[PDB]
Amino acid sequence: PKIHYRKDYKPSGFIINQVTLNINIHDQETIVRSVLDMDISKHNVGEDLVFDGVGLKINEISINNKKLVEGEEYTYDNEFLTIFSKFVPKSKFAFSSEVIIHPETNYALTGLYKSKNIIVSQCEATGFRRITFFIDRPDMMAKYDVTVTADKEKYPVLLSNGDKVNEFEIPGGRHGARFNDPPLKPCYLFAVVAGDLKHLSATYITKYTKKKVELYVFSEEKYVSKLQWALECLKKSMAFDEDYFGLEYDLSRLNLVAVSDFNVGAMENKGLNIFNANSLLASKKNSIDFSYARILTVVGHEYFHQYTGNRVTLRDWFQLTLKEGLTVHRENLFSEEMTKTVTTRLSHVDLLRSVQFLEDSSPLSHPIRPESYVSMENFYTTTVYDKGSEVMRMYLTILGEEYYKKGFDIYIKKNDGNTATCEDFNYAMEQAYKMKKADNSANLNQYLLWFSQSGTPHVSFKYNYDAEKKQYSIHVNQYTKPDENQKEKKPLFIPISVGLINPENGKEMISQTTLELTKESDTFVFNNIAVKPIPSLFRGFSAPVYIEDQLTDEERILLLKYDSDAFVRYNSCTNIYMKQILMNYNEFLKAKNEKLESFQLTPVNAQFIDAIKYLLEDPHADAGFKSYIVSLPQDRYIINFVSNLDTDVLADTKEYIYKQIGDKLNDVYYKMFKSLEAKADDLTYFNDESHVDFDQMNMRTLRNTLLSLLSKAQYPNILNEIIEHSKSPYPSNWLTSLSVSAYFDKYFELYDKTYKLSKDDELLLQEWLKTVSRSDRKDIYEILKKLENEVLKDSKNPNDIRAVYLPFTNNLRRFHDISGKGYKLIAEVITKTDKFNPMVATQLCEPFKLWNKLDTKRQELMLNEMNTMLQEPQISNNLKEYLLRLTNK
């Protein structure tokens, strides 16, 4: 296993100036001819010329049109092509090759492959070497001249990067298209697509240069009616980058293409963005609400890459977070502006603190710029993406919008057209910091520790108020636990956005304030504070940390009801829930351990339940926010706080708490479920795909959340409401009716009904699979076996496999069955998937990430399955590497 180290970066001894490709797609094979116009760099030391080339069948290779001979002048081992240095020219030369590849049987979906009837590439990170020989690293920038030929009937639409400069007929029913893309790019941004594609199009006129840009969105013919929202989102994305960042698209055309088989969400190939169909296609009849926010975010994300990743690219793969963290941050700003709902920010926090915090306290923990890797296919993590985004967002918090924009422009103007590193961005932000602070001695050197230090900081507080002096102090401490990456952790630059709430009237007592904590601890003092305040801490979730607010539940309730910041209200509620959860968990655990015949549980705080009722009944309060306060914290958030977590005890704990609150609020829940119906399910714009109302979708989220709570509670005659809900035109509603019917003998009647509604749309059927997989059923294992035999079968579509199995792994009681049979089942699926798609097999490992946090029996069960997978003779590099790190070997 070759380990690559960040510290070892060195420029290549070679240069590739021009790539000229001919890609000839045939029935049983694709022939790729490539001419590379090359040179010797100032770094050359007479080394052999080594190309990346994986799984290529060589027809011939030449230098300066002289055919090379295998053995004598080169060797190829199916991974590297080595040309012995004595045969490498000492000035500009042409390297040429012709190889054969087989997209039809490329089920790993990397390189050039076939998805249904579409030929499509995926080159990030090191997939270009699966198409032709190359020095496959992002600092090898070159111009591309690409010709694609193919059967015209099967593949009428041909696309690649750049301008289409020729189209031509070929004998025997074939045709070709030539694309020239003069700006330099790294090879991971190369793309080609061939297929019988249908489209929608529009023209966008840029804000300042007034350039006309052609926008095309493509899919297979069957789903062309699902393209409209994506096109609207693309327009919105272009406008936002123009309006917030002053950035305009500078190419003549941008193509978005949906394919059914894709390892991730989408890919920002220059001028030719390629999408998982589930992240591009939607219609109100055939998609759940979540698709609309998903398409907005993924279209936005790929568009924002045009500057942050494409025009400014990466020196090397260790800089990944420079394009991904920064582009997620740009997409978050975009989606917050487009949706205008507080739940947008809250949902990104929720994701970070459950999934990313779990990663950062697991054996997989890494900084957002790792020091090493074995597999790039495993490198695209929530740490790099989501913690990266929070680190990119902290610059905006620290600088404020005016100076952040100044700093961002410096970054773009200094690095446009080049490779860049994380230091380049920090440098640009630093220039703005000096300006904001009005002194050139100010620096952000400490800030760089956010790129290198792993683990989640813990921030805790003590307060003091002098009533005579009208003086309030906030004493703050930070602490990162030592881990495998750093024995000694250093204090970070932590920005703490704060407010001070007057508890008598709920009003703000100070102006907007961001505390700059740069030491292990500091005390922040405020004068002229007329009454003891309740502090509103880390407003907007201003740093990616464990917050320990040291507030009473009474104080947290006051914030939940009256604070101005959505995150702090949501966090205060979260903290009340966590205090209850840990208390009840320990009470149940002790009863279990001691085999007690009787015992007591601490009830849920009554004033807390009253506060939930208060907010729920407030007609001017936000529906999405309301759905968060009636939901307990995510299991994967909770597990970061409990050692040797007994999943059964936690399930019992959650049930007790929900039942406590429902016993008080169920009539309120029901009343709201009924009163919300008219607005939530309004059909006025059902046949307008341009019209998307995120408040209305949040109202449906609330109804569907309440319906779930009422169903579990077996609220009187709630099955009537369930049956009626199943007749709604909105899939979010009728799929909810399936999952909440789990608690009734009508489940399989609804199973069949919703199957019939879903089966004729590929993406809708995937949503139906997810709904079944996640169903709270005692017979869920039998149900899963039925899905396998009747629907999934031997599909190699990652969306199908992920839909059937991942939601089930969140079934706290059943996936974690003490027999270990859920662990055994997912490990079988992982091993089976690893035969043809190692990247997706490793994604299917996600349930095991928390293995060493569970009770010792479940730890042992999970470890046994992971060691079983590790012992498979045919295990991929991806899966082996991942499982070795995860099991601490």
Ligand SMILES: O=C(NO)[C@H](NC(=O)[C@H]1[C@H]2C[C@@H]3C[C@@H](C[C@H]1C3)C2)c1ccc(-c2cc(F)c(F)c(F)c2)cc1
């Ligand atoms: O950043 C990206 N597009 O701009 C893109 N990432 C994603 O789509 C992520 C984003 C959006 C999603 C939710 C979550 C996981 C998935 C889907 C974060 C992406 C693209 C290519 C790859 C990628 C890397 C490989 F090494 C590889 F072999 C491959 F096939 C794809 C991984 C992530």
Ligand SMILES: [Mg+2]
């Ligand atoms: Mg091959």
Ligand SMILES: [Mg+2]
């Ligand atoms: Mg405009």
Ligand SMILES: [Mg+2]
């Ligand atoms: Mg299919």
Ligand SMILES: [Mg+2]
């Ligand atoms: Mg380890």
Ligand SMILES: [Zn+2]
């Ligand atoms: Zn990205």
